[PDB]
Structure 1
Amino acid sequence: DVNCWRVYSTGSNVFQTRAGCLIGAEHVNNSYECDIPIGAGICASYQTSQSIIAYTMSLGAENSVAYSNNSIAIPTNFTISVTTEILPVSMTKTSVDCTMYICGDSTECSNLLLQYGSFCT
């Protein structure tokens, strides 16, 4: 949250973004898919000497369907694909001893802890 100065140390290729101040990354005019998110539609990536650049991410290739009021497109051939999907179902089962964790082997500590009502149970 610093407008870009107010920053202590400056350098080369100081960049001002809607997400803050970016130091050390060149600014380009192209637009690729997002690699390292920054904010406000700005993404940075490392590429070709090699340098870190920051751009405005591109949503994807743009095409226009050849839509006409008396035209249809019929497929003639197919492909059988197979995908995978991972789902967690359960996690580990843990259990603690409230007396052992707080006090341990001491006996006066148990007597002092007994005042608290039923937290352990």
Structure 2
Amino acid sequence: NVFQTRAGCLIGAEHVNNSYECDIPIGAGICASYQTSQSIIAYTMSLGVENSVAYSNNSIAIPTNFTISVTTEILPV
């Protein structure tokens, strides 16, 4: 598996045309991930799931339900 990219020579990974959420940073719009008999794959960073919101002059949406969520924040002092 001898491959090349914008960052440079990359060996040990396999290029995948699919776009998924990725963690390990590479740079130049590239990631590396361990997936499926499993190896490391490299592919262009994904923006997430695509959602097309409808738009109209008379169309409007109001929430019919709500959920109370509690998050956390940690800062050094």
The TM-score, its normalising length taken from structure 1, stands at 0.60
Q: Could you report, residue by residue, the CA deviation over 1:74-108 in whole angstroms, capped at 9, with x for unpaired residues? A: 111111110110011xxxxxxxxxxxxxxxxxxxx
In structure 2, how many angstroms separate the alpha carbons of the residues matched to 1:30 and 1:64? 20
Bigger share in strand: 2
Greater C-alpha radius of gyration: 1
Q: Which has the higher contact order (CA 8 A, sep 6+)?
A: 2
The TM-score, its normalising length taken from structure 2, stands at 0.92
In structure 2, how many angstroms separate the alpha carbons of the residues matched to 1:84 and 1:14? 44
Instruction: Give aligned pairs, total.
Output: 77
Shift of 1:40: 0.6
Shift of 1:55: 0.5
5+ long unaligned stretches in structure 2: none
Q: Report % sequence identity.
A: 97
Q: Could you report, residue by residue, the CA deviation over 1:5-35 in whole angstroms, capped at 9, with x for unpaired residues? A: xxxxxxxx21111011101111111111122
Bigger share in helix: 1
Does 2:42 match 1:41?
Answer: no
Q: Secondary structure at the match of 1:61?
A: coil
Runs of 4+ that moved beyond 6 A: none
